[PDB]
């Protein structure tokens, strides 16, 4: 029973963007534009069900070029949503259909919400080499796209999950970096080493699902879930670190992550969602970090045996990024480092007698080496089993004073706010049911005024704006109970309701005494 700003879309919502006081939703067959203040629908754009034909390419008049009778409508599920501000501000969207190509929508000055005025597909054929397609960006089987401007150009780091049927005719790249041409009419690969693929024999036996991707300390990181080796049937999570100099893939390394619960020790080896944030003072001194350091917060789950499907058993681990980099640079020796098993062959010339140069942490060479670690980076659960019997599916993080607070969403559709601390009871101070649908890991956190912002959370066809503070009060129904709230929530009794002083508009707000009746 919570009155919150929400919006329904009549189709599932994939990715979401916040930019210039407008909220951009990338939903199945549509792109919605809502006003940030009230989540009222302002603009629409129909990327709706589209007809596919081999002789038809993006931006073409397909109805005049080919025979379209009996065509099966294909639903265009959004896959990537990006906003560019380097040049003229625009919105790049990548869908699942039409070879996974992307399109851009340009914003006018007088009106910053015209997404249907100037739209250019980003596609250019390759008549010279008919097998190469740098504009085929996104796999419909799962893709994670991270864009960044560097050296006066726009770069697209893409992780794609590949089915074996793509490889024969329509192939994609497991990890790639594409540069947007200055004419904004196509991507390009600068070298043979701008992309790393899985061997054709391992397209089926070695799936790779890309969970997260971020940039930190002039490095690109990709959180993914793979098989531990090749002949094994168990799955685990790896973090992937690489450098990008002049749009290249240099110093590529994969390192396994392990989130254990010592209460012998069970491992939660499947990442469900992550979020990089800086810590509050308490947690910071609890994990040997500084206030300005980037921490990777991860929500893990335990795998059903010999599978990558997680059961309703979750955990939460913190990985300071500086400790990750130091683990890359120090643990390396003559036994932990390995060759990339799915990139090269298991029996390759490089996988036998080539070592990472010690002249190196980010150098670009003509013959780049791509490695894979044996020893994992382990951390203990910070909730210590509190969520060891549910499936967490969303996480974000903010700071209230010296406290680091985590926003969690579950498989059952529950939203909850908890305080993250190793020494202390990890008991959620906020806990309710957003929707019957699972909570999507794609979320937003926006800070306004003094640490009093909000977070956008997605469930099914609905997205809700949830305030970062004051929800712990709104479930108490008596002043004698409103007085017992934990001190950091700053609750008080407003005549008939329990809120914080900001939400008590008129009347009396008390936080000291309460006078019950007998």
């Amino acid at each position, epitope marked *: 029973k919570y009155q919150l700003p929400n919006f329904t879309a009549e189709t599932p919502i994939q990715n979401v963007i916040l930019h210039e006081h407008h909220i951009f939703l990338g939903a199945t067959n549509y792109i919605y534009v809502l006003n940030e203040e009230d989540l009222q629908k302002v603009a629409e754009y129909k990327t709706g069900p589209v007809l596919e034909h081999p002789d038809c390419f993006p931006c073409q008049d397909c109805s005049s*070029k080919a025979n379209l009778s009996g065509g099966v409508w294909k639903d265009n599920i959004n896959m990537a949503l990006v906003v560019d501000t380097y040049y003229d501000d625009q919105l790049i969207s990548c869908g699942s259909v039409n070879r996974g190509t992307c399109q851009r929508h340009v914003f006018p000055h007088n009106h910053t919400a015209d997404i249907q005025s100037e739209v*250019h597909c980003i596609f*250019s*054929p390759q*008549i010279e080499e008919p097998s190469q397609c740098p504009d085929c960006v996104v796999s419909a089987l799962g893709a994670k796209v991270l864009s960044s401007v560097k050296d006066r150009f726009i770069n697209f780091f893409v992780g794609n999950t590949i089915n074996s049927s793509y490889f024969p005719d329509h192939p994609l790249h497991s990890i790639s970096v594409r540069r947007l041409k200055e004419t904004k009419d*196509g991507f390009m690969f600068l070298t043979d080493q701008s992309y790393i693929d899985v061997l054709p024999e391992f397209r089926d036996s070695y799936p790779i699902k890309y969970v997260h991707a971020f940039e930190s300390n002039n490095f690109i990181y990709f959180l993914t879930v793979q098989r531990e080796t090749l002949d094994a049937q168990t799955f685990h999570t790896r973090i992937i670190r690489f450098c990008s100099i002049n749009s290249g893939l240099h110093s590529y390394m994969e390192m396994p992550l392990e989130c254990i619960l010592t209460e012998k020790k069970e491992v939660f080896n499947i990442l469900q969602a992550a979020y990089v944030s800086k810590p509050g003072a308490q947690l910071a001194r609890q994990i040997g970090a500084s206030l300005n350091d980037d921490i990777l917060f991860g929500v893990f789950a335990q795998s059903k045996p010999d599978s990558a499907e997680p059961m309703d058993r979750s955990a939460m681990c913190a990985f300071p990024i500086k400790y990750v980099n130091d683990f890359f640079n120090k643990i390396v020796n003559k036994n932990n480092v390995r060759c990339l098993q799915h990139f090269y062959g298991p029996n390759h010339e490089h996988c036998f007698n080539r070592t990472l140069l010690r002249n190196s942490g980010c150098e670009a060479r003509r013959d780049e080496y791509r490695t894979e670690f044996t020893t994992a980076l382990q951390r203990v659960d910070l909730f210590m089993g509190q969520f060891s019997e549910v499936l967490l599916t969303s996480i974000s993080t903010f700071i209230k004073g010296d406290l680091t607070i985590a926003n969690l969403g579950t498989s059952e559709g529950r939203f909850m706010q908890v305080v993250v601390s190793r020494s202390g009871p990890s008991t959620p101070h906020v806990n309710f049911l957003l929707d019957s649908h699972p909570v999507s890991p794609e979320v937003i956190v926006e800070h306004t005024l003094n640490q009093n912002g909000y977070t956008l959370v997605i469930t099914g066809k609905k997205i809700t704006k949830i305030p970062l503070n004051g929800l712990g009060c709104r479930h108490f129904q008596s002043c004698s109970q409103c007085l017992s709230a934990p001190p950091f929530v700053q609750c008080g009794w407003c005549h008939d309701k329990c809120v914080r002083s900001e939400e008590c508009l008129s009347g009396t707000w008390t936080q000291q005494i309460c006078l019950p009746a007998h």
Partner: antibody, heavy 119, light 108 residues
Framework: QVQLVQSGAEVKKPGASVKVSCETSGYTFTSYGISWVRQAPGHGLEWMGWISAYNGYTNYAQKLQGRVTMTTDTSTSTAYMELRSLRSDDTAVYYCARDLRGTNYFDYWGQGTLVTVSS | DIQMTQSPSSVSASVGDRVTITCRASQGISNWLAWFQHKPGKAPKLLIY???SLLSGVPSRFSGSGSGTDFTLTISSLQPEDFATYYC?????????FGQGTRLEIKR
């Protein structure tokens, strides 16, 4: 060497028809489409039609009153064009070009044949 | 039908000059546009496809620009081998339509 080799020049009387051939070599034939483009003395290029050997799809210009008929032999990888009800307007040079399927980007051409229509 | 409009119809330049031919599309064709160089006695030579993508072997001095309905072909420093009749073609819809051409002539 990827080459398109058209037939010889031809002279026809008005009312009759003409059939021009275009033998291609150097690539998998079905993987590309064949378009036809003619040019009359004193005029520029004019698209006549496109044919896809894969699908058998054909599209002709409404300016030609449906007098055009394009065919394709895949086993020999040759294209054929037929223009019926010839008028003096149709005296021109006919070119046979290839494109990467639906791209309509004509990389390699034929040498072009001269077709002369006059009484 | 969708109409292409080249400009100018004919222009004369010396060796070492920049020459630009503009093409105007009736409807938005995105970047489905090609430029052709046509010399007497031979077939048209494809120079630039996808509005700005150069074919292998075409010199660097040829440059393509434009998107939607306005397009531009640019030769930075002309050379004798570059004087010909240039054509503007679309690749967006049927019927496929060309431009009226542009004659390039040496100035003496």
């Amino acid at each position: 060497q990827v080459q398109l080799v058209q037939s010889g020049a031809e002279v026809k009387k008005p009312g009759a028809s003409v059939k021009v051939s275009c033998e291609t070599s150097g690539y998998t034939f079905t993987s590309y489409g064949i378009s036809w483009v003619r040019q009359a003395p004193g005029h520029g290029l004019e698209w006549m039609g496109w044919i896809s050997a894969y699908n058998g799809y054909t599209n002709y210009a409404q300016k030609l009153q449906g007098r055009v008929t394009m065919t394709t032999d895949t086993s020999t990888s040759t294209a054929y064009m037929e223009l019926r009800s010839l008028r003096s307007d149709d005296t021109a040079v006919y070119y046979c070009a290839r494109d990467l399927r639906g791209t309509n980007y004509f990389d390699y051409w034929g040498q072009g044949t001269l077709v002369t229509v006059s009484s | 039908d969708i109409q292409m409009t080249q400009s100018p119809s004919s222009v004369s330049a010396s060796v070492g000059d920049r020459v630009t031919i503009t093409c105007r599309a009736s409807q938005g064709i995105s970047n489905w546009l090609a430029w052709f160089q046509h010399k007497p006695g031979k077939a048209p030579k494809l120079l630039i496809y996808a509005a700005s993508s150069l074919l292998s072997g075409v010199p660097s001095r040829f440059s393509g620009s434009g998107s939607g309905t306005d397009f531009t072909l640019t030769i930075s420093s002309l050379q004798p081998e570059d004087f010909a009749t240039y054509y503007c073609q679309q690749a967006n819809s049927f019927p496929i339509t060309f431009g009226q051409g542009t004659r390039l002539e040496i100035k003496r």
